[PDB]
Amino acid sequence: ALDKSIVVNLTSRLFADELAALQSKIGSVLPLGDCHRLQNIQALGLGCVCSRETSPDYIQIMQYLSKCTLAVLEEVRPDSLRLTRMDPSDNLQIKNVYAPFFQWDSNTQLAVLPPLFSRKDSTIVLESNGFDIVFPMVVPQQLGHAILQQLLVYHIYSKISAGAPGDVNMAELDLYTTNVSFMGRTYRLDVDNTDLRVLDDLSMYLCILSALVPRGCLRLLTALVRHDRHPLTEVFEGVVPDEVTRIDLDQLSVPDDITRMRVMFSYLQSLSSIFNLGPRLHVYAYSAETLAASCWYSPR
Amino acid sequence: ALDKSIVVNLTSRLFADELAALQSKIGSVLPLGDCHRLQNIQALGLGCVCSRETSPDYIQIMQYLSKCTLAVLEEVRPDSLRLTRMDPSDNLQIKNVYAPFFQWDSNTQLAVLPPLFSRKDSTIVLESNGFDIVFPMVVPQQLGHAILQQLLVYHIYSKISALDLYTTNVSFMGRTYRLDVDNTDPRTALRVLDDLSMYLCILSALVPRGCLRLLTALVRHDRHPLTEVFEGVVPDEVTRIDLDQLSVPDDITRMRVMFSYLQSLSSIFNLGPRLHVYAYSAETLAASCWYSPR
Amino acid sequence: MEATLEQRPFPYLATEANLLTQIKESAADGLFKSFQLLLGKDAREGSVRF
Amino acid sequence: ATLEQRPFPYLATEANLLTQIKESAADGLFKSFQLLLGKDAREGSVRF
Amino acid sequence: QAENAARLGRQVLGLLPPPTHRVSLTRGPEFARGVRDLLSKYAASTRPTVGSLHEALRQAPFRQPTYGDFLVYSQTFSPQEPLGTFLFSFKQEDNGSSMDMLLTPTSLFMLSGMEAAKAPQTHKVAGVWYGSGSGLADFIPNLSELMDTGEFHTLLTPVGPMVQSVHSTFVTKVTSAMKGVGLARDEPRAHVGLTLPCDMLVDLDESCPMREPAGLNVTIYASLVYLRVNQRPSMALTFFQSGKGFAEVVAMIKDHFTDVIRTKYIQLRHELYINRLVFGAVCTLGTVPFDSHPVHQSLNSLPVLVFANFEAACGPWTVFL
Amino acid sequence: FFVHPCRGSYRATHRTMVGNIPQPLAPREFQESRGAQFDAVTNMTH
Amino acid sequence: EALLGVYTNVVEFVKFLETALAAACVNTEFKDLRRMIDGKIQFKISMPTIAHGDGRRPNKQRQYIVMKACNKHHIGAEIELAAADIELLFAEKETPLDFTEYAGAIKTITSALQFGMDALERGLVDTVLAVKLRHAPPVFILKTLGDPVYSERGLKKAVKSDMVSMFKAHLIEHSFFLDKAELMTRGKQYVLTMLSDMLAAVCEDTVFKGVSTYTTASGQQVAGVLETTDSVMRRLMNLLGQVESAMSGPAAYASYVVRGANLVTAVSYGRAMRNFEQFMARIVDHPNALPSVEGDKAALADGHDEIQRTRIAASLVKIGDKFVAIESLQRMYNETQFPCPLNRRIQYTYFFPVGLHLPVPRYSTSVSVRGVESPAIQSTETWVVNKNNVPLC
Amino acid sequence: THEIASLHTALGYSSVIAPAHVAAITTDMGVHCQDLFMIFPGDAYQDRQLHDYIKMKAGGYAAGVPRCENLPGLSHGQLATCEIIPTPVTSDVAYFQTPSNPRGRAACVVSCDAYSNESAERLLYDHSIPDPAYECRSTNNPWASQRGSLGDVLYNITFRQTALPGMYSPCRQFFHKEDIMRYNRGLYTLVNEYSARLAGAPATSTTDLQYVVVNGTDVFLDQPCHMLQEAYPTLAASHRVMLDEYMSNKQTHAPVHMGQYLIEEVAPMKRLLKLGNKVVY
């Protein structure tokens, strides 16, 4: 019985060139900063947070997509765009026009990821308003948890080669990271190593974990000796490395160790959710010739 | 469509004293036990798990909170309390009268927490019926997390004592606060810590070597604003692990399992049910939000 | 529930067609499932009970 | 002799049948009963 | 014969989505007269009748599932099922146009290869629906290797209970249900509930009491446990039923699998392979209403529960340990 | 094939040459007409 | 430039009861088949015996009882109605373009409701034909089973081998009989003895044989329908005259309603009669009356006596003394792009040697071959002739 | 949804089908043999150098229609596979002019007593009993009719249907024991099941090669070689010369010459053989 439609007006008319790119993607999933039907241009992309002048971010986008309302294009009329609203547990249809092209199958789970690839694959620049709309990177969930992971390893060894040449071979790094195997098929992603400033925030976090985790687990084992110790924690003493168990904790004092343990957990919950929880939607029907996938949106 | 309203029968006329406190907090979230219109007053409190004579355990209270259905008040009549209900997935007006005051806006995020700053301020006692009522606290997720961060750090460093400024203070931009610990049962707060010792020593076994060598190139000279934890000195442990040669396909299998166990830490750092505010009014203190149990 | 045979004393009807051709051989190798012979002392209407 | 929930046109009696039924059916006064709670207490459908 | 065609004029036009609430402003305050289903308190009389309350019974919520259509080899999906079993969609590679692989929990017992006394009842029944187990294992030649690295939980997507199976000789058509209560095909006006074997299900809220809150929601969880038996890798799938919130059940599942965690990790004092460390994963198969009684049944025996008013909502697999 | 004593079982060797195929199954009038086909292919002189 | 015309189709609506295929069926409209569990037809075959006073032991009286059941069938369809089609079905009293925007949307839903009926009217003719094709064994099996002279004694071991010998000989000689009429000099009389032998092999013993269901003009009696494709029907219509090409048959189905005393036993008990009232008048109203074909015919023809007889466009034919209707169903299958079931594929297996010897006293019979006859020669290949008559090794 | 109930009131068979007019021959009746490298991909010789040597001397799905990509196009139609059953050099040619089994023993189980699996097996396998066809010999080739023989080793395999399309085997019906024992029953239970059930693993249609149909939807075919359990001979001529004698004069043709032979085809279809412009029907 309820009415859902989202109609965005503009100040100036579109060019004839820019209309053909939006007609290329007439079925899509755009994020959208407001729930009301009448709205200005400055929210419906990723230009509200990510821009050229600002430094590119991963986490501040992934914080934003969970907080944001999604929407689907229906008809592109100059100058008034016409989206439709995405509701909780609502059944609708998606065409898959995204660059680069990952093949969808039915009975997969779509995960909206931020675009970390090149600019011309991602965004469409509107010259009439001078504002950039950015289409998000819709990738299936098992790819999206793997297309991130090999590129996050590539960003680490690129930071090692820039600090010292002899530690990394480029032919070893390129062969094992840029080629992604999924569902039997392979995808050679565009590396864009021409100068990945998106993933520098995650490469800072996962390393600051990696030093503080084995320093942190030694204290948390010994501080929990009881008669009522949980019986599975006797097992995982055989998992910890022997070099980890030899820490002299006399080197760090008590005013240093409270700072570490609060830094220890505060990265752990901030980094756990940004791998886990995004706007994620299922697909139950697909046809490759029409490129039309019927979906239903689960908000989490 | 659906109805949701709970009118609470009560066996004694309330006094004008306790009627003034309940009239002051007229929009307020509190859990209750059973899903019916008519209800005893002994379900409305959170005090069925948080009593005076029993030592409360705030994790178990918070563990209790994700089970219960939640409710918002509508009126306080001198006989009966009248409440409305929160069900998935319904938009509803919520109005914060919560005494350690924080500021919200449109498109904020919320979660429900037990009273962790002032129990005496957040619990009013009913001497008329003998049963006391405990209100919970609603907090945005950033301080919603950062209180449970400091509470788990406390129960690690109270056991080592077998002083206060580092253990019991929640930090935030602009303000500092005091957690309320005088009598806490740590045992339900320690089975959480027992499972942290399970995950964290597995995460110490599958550490990638290239990410440790990245810090040995970083923190010695390249000083950044967010690496001031190490204070410019490498730890003694990090120099001991990077003696091997780096190889890419070893860390590919490590960073997948590093990725998959950080999916599991959601289960140990869970808040209660979450509240997604889409519109919040500033001068009226009301909001609009849809309830999602997870 | 499967449909089952029953020997109740129905008021059977009379058809113009004959049915007799090939029945003795069709009972041996089954032309049709769920049959029952009745020889001489038992070829009658069974007694009605309820 | 089988119990069945077919929608019979049940006839009405003057005498009450309710005295000690909560603790006679549970302790086995009479064989072959069936208790029906809530939405089950209905004359459901006919299927021949 | 237009009397047959006017029936579809009745039944299609009566069975549509409710239209958008749009009234022109020049008509005036007539839109408030068209808000009937938001009104939720109806007047009662001294003797209320159906003719008094046929308007109160008329406004109903808008509920509809989203079915799935699967086309299955008839060797895998056994031709006789109790019509309410839960399903999974194993997926390795798109080889053809549409040939889909579906796994019932009794079929996934046979690919596992676990011991008899782990599930003592369904081993007899799943051994008569199938052969020795190699009628199914020829489709997945990677069952030895998917269990070592631990990729098998990433390849199952929980779909939901059956609604209809139209069975042919070489190919079985299977229509399942996502997003809610699927409408029963053969019986009209009916609802297909979800049927689980009593052997696989592990209840979680059970007490003397020796008091816990009630609610509106109790959620069936699935689990899948990587283990080793006879120095050979094998899996174990169980079910869980509790309304305790996700923060407790992950701690409640670890107490159930305490023995299996210990007997595995006695091995890795000698060999430490990082691929072996992944142990289990937990999905969320959708909610059950509170205080609906699971009704026991028996089929050939095989004791099989059934849940009324099961509505489905699939979740991802999260790796617990 | 042959029987091998111990329960006994059937065990196998291999007829290596062609002529180890027994004479009811590859007779001698065939086996020298097969030889004259060898003689005419190679174009040898006797 | 301008348009010249806009042309579309009108879908040819062909229902079940207008086709001649309902001569092979008996049609009853049954209101609530959603409620039925099972069907039942109960035969009771009383077999007489000859008394003869040889050394035989005489037989007592025999009796057979035969049970039959229904078979359910389910048909599906599909309608996809658009979003804005349902949306603008409601708002009106706008500009006259919004009437012709509205009236173009009711023309979309009614054409989508014809299509839901058209896909279901073809479903009857599909499932009825697919029931006939499952209970239709071929000629070569049934011909030597339809004559009692081979199995008077019973099917022992020596009879079955003498029937399998006749399955093979009828399969090699008399198969593809309309293709063999070209090369035979007799020709048109061979097919007519072939196709009347298919006619005499079918069991005519139907319960409804005395029921008068179809007739011709001048009251003659239609017996059966033979169904071909379009290609075979051109042959059979030219060899044999289409003598009348119009038959009489019912206009509607037979009704069966569970009203009355059927409804009490349907609700109280789990069963229900067919025609309880006529069934009652035999048991209690007039007992101990032996069944006799002459006066019991009104209870066999329940409903099918007195349906309005209407003229049916068809094509009949003379075979012996039996009139046969000839159908072709390709217009109901080629318009929907589904392949016809009477078009059909037959797989044979072809047995074939290569590389043998011949034993020692070698012989010949050929008068004219000059070459190969030397004893030292050996054949290491055999030649086959293809479909396109290209010989290959 | 529309619900229709159908019921058969006649006792005997009230409908009879018959083949009338051959429209076209689909399968090319040519010479292409089945390659076991592709059906049994696992088994191999020990040396990689010698197993790659023998593969040099011999040698998937697409939108639901399985297509072979080694052949770009075909001109004679769907390409027929051939097996090879090895056979002694002294097996009689007189077995080959009459329709029979490719193994040396006749396998018609319809004649045997109903529901007697041991009497049916004893017909197929035991050699105390001469053939139901021939009283002179027990078996034409002991390489295929014998119980553990290479016919019964290769082609007794129940179909396993990998993710790859899988390929059809003409010999596999004549050797498979369990699909033969399905016909051990009474006559009228066989005639009822003849037109209703599609038998075990037949060939596909309108493809490149003969694939075993793994998705049976609307494939209508019926095949009489399972029931009657014989295989029909074709034209064979061990030299090119003796195929000329069959087309010059069909009557005074000699079936067996000194070294060579000929088999005239005995088939339910009788084609027009036309080589040159001389036509022999």
The domain of A155 spans: 141-190
Strands E297-299 and B81-86: unpaired
Measured between CA atoms, how close is H229 to chain C, in angstroms? Answer: 21
CA distance B131 to B41: 8
Same domain, A186 and A280: no
Number of domains within chain A: 3
Q: Which two tokens stand for residue C19?
A: 């049915």
Q: Per the CB < 8 Å rule, is E8 touching G86?
A: no
User: Is the previous residue joined to A100 through a cis bond, with omega within 30 degrees of 0?
Assistant: yes
Look-up of token digits 């040898």 = F44
In A, which residues are within 8 Å of B194 by CB distance? 224, 229-230, 233
What element of type H or E holds H48?
A: helix H48-58
G81, G50 contact by CB (below 8 A): no
At residue A134, the 3 state secondary structure works out as strand
CB pairs under 8 A between C and H: 22
Measured between CA atoms, how close is D25 to chain G, in angstroms? Answer: 26
At residue H37, the 3 state secondary structure works out as helix
Q: What sections of chain G are H helices per DSSP?
A: 83-87, 97-100, 103-132, 139-142, 157-173, 188-201, 230-239, 261-268, 276-283, 297-300
Same domain, B128 and B7: yes
CA distance E129 to E123: 10
Q: Which residues of A68-105 are buried (b: 16+ CB within 10 A; e: fewer)?
A: bbbbbbbebeebebebbbbbeebbbebbbbbeeebebe
B29, B95 contact by CB (below 8 A): no
Q: Which residues of A281-297 are buried (b: 16+ CB within 10 A; e: fewer)?
A: bbbbebeeeeeebbbbb
What resolution in angstroms does the PDB record give?
3.8
Nearest by CB: G375 against F33, F34, F40 = F33
Measured between CA atoms, how close is G326 to chain H, in angstroms? Answer: 14
Look-up of token digits 């072939």 = G194
Rounded to the nearest angstrom, the gap between the alpha carbon of residue B206 and the centroid of all alpha carbons in its chain is 30
* N- to C-terminal Cα separation, chain G: 64
User: Is the previous residue joined to E209 through a cis bond, with omega within 30 degrees of 0?
Assistant: yes
**Does any CB of chain E come closer than 8 Å to the CB of residue G130?**
no
**Please, which residues 1-50 of chain C have a Cβ atom closer than 8 Å to chain G?**
1-7, 10-25, 27-29, 32-41, 43
**Does any CB of chain D come closer than 8 Å to the CB of residue G5?**
no
Q: What is the CA radius of gyration of chain F?
A: 17
Q: Looking at the domain assignment, is residue B279 inside a domain? A: yes
E283, E291 contact by CB (below 8 A): no
In H, which residues are within 8 Å of C30 by CB distance? 186, 188-189
**Does any CB of chain F come closer than 8 Å to the CB of residue H89?**
yes
**Angle A59-67/A254-276 helices, nearest 10 degrees?**
60
Q: Is residue B235 classed exposed, middle or buried when 0-12, 13-18 and 19+ CB atoms within 10 A define those classes?
A: buried
In G, which residues are within 8 Å of H186 by CB distance? 155
Contacts of H253 (CB under 8 A, 6+ apart): G366, H245, H246, H262
Q: Looking at the domain assignment, is residue B185 inside a domain? A: no
Q: Which two tokens stand for residue E271?
A: 């060999």
Measured between CA atoms, how close is F26 to chain H, in angstroms? Answer: 6
CA distance C43 to G62: 7
HSE at residue A20, side-chain half, CA atoms within 13 A, is 2
**Does any CB of chain H come closer than 8 Å to the CB of residue C15?**
no
What element of type H or E holds A150?
A: helix A149-161
Same domain, B15 and B158: no
Task: Read off the DSSP letter of residue G384.
Answer: E
Same domain, B86 and B166: no
CA distance B27 to B35: 20
**DSSP letter string, H130-161:** --SS-SS-S-S-TTTSSTTSHHHHHS-PPP--
Q: Looking at the domain assignment, is residue A206 inside a domain? A: yes
Measured between CA atoms, how close is C10 to chain H, in angstroms? Answer: 18
Question: What is the widest separation between alpha-carbon atoms in chain F?
Answer: 56
Task: Report the 3 state secondary structure along chain B.
Answer: CCCCCEEECCCCCCCHHHHHHHHHCCCCEEEECCCCCEECHHHCCCCCCCCCCCCCCHHHHHHHHCCCEEEEEEEECCCCEEEEEECCCCEECCECCCCCCCCCCCCCEEEEECCCCCHHHHEECCCCCCCCEECCEEECHHHHHHHHHHHHHHHHHHHCCCCCCCCCEEECCCCEEECCCCCCCCCCCCHHHHHHHHHHHHHCCCCCHHHHHHHHHHCCCCCCCCCCCCCCCCCCCHHHHCCCCCCHHHHHHHHHHHHHHCCHHHCCCCCCCEEEEEEECCCCCEEEEEEECC
Q: Per the CB < 8 Å rule, is E12 touching G113?
A: yes
Cβ count within 10 A of residue A108: 20
Same domain, A6 and A136: yes
Same domain, A160 and A63: no
| E and B make contact (3+ CB pairs below 8 Å) | yes
At residue E185, the 3 state secondary structure works out as coil
Q: Per the CB < 8 Å rule, is G376 touching F29?
A: no
Q: Per the CB < 8 Å rule, is G351 touching H100?
A: yes
Same domain, A259 and A280: no
Q: Which of E58, E66, E258 to mutate to test the interface with A (most CBs of A within 10 A)?
A: E66
E270, E299 contact by CB (below 8 A): no
Angle at alpha carbon of residue B218, lines to B215 and B220, rounded to 5°: 105
Measured between CA atoms, how close is H134 to chain E, in angstroms? Answer: 38
**Please, which residues 54-83 of chain H have a Cβ atom closer than 8 Å to chain E?**
60-61, 63-64
**Please, which residues 122-181 of chain E have a Cβ atom closer than 8 Å to chain B?**
none
Same domain, A5 and A135: yes
- Write the single-letter amino acid at E6: A
Q: What is the CA radius of gyration of chain B?
A: 23
CB pairs under 8 A between D and G: 20
At residue H4, the 3 state secondary structure works out as strand
Which residues are registered as beta bridge partners of B253?
A: none
CA distance A160 to A174: 14
At residue A176, the 3 state secondary structure works out as helix
In H, which residues are within 8 Å of E140 by CB distance? none
**Does any CB of chain H come closer than 8 Å to the CB of residue F35?**
no
Same domain, A135 and A147: no
Q: Looking at the domain assignment, is residue A195 inside a domain? A: no
For chain B, list the contacting chains (3+ Cβ pairs, <8 Å): A, E
- Strand residues in chain G grouped as ranges (E): 28-30, 41-45, 64-68, 71-75, 215-216, 222-228, 246-250, 254-256, 309-313, 316-319, 322-328, 350-351, 384-385, 391-392
Contacts of G270 (CB under 8 A, 6+ apart): D6, D47, D48, G37
Same domain, A112 and A9: yes
Strands B38-39 and B6-8: parallel
Measured between CA atoms, how close is C6 to chain H, in angstroms? Answer: 18
Q: What is the CA radius of gyration of chain E?
A: 24
A67, A31 contact by CB (below 8 A): no
CA distance E176 to E181: 11
Which residues are registered as beta bridge partners of C49?
A: none
Strands E302-304 and G215-216: unpaired
Contacts of G153 (CB under 8 A, 6+ apart): G159
Same domain, B91 and B111: yes
**Does any CB of chain A come closer than 8 Å to the CB of residue E316?**
yes
- Write the single-letter amino acid at E136: L
G312, G245 contact by CB (below 8 A): no
Angle at alpha carbon of residue E248, lines to A274 and E277, rounded to 5°: 60
- Strand residues in H121-280 grouped as ranges (E): 232-233, 236-237, 262-263, 273-275, 278-280
H156: nearest Cα among H193, H197, H103, H204: H103
At residue H21, the 3 state secondary structure works out as coil
Q: Per the CB < 8 Å rule, is B159 touching A207?
A: no
Q: Which two tokens stand for residue G86?
A: 């349902």
Contacts of A66 (CB under 8 A, 6+ apart): A277, A278, A279, A300
Task: Read off the DSSP letter of residue C46.
Answer: P
E292, E308 contact by CB (below 8 A): yes
**Does any CB of chain B come closer than 8 Å to the CB of residue A236?**
yes
**Does any CB of chain D come closer than 8 Å to the CB of residue G269?**
yes
G371, H252 contact by CB (below 8 A): no
Contacts of H198 (CB under 8 A, 6+ apart): E169, H216, H219, H221
Same domain, B22 and B129: yes
- Tell me which chain H residue has its CA closest to the CA of residue F27: H90
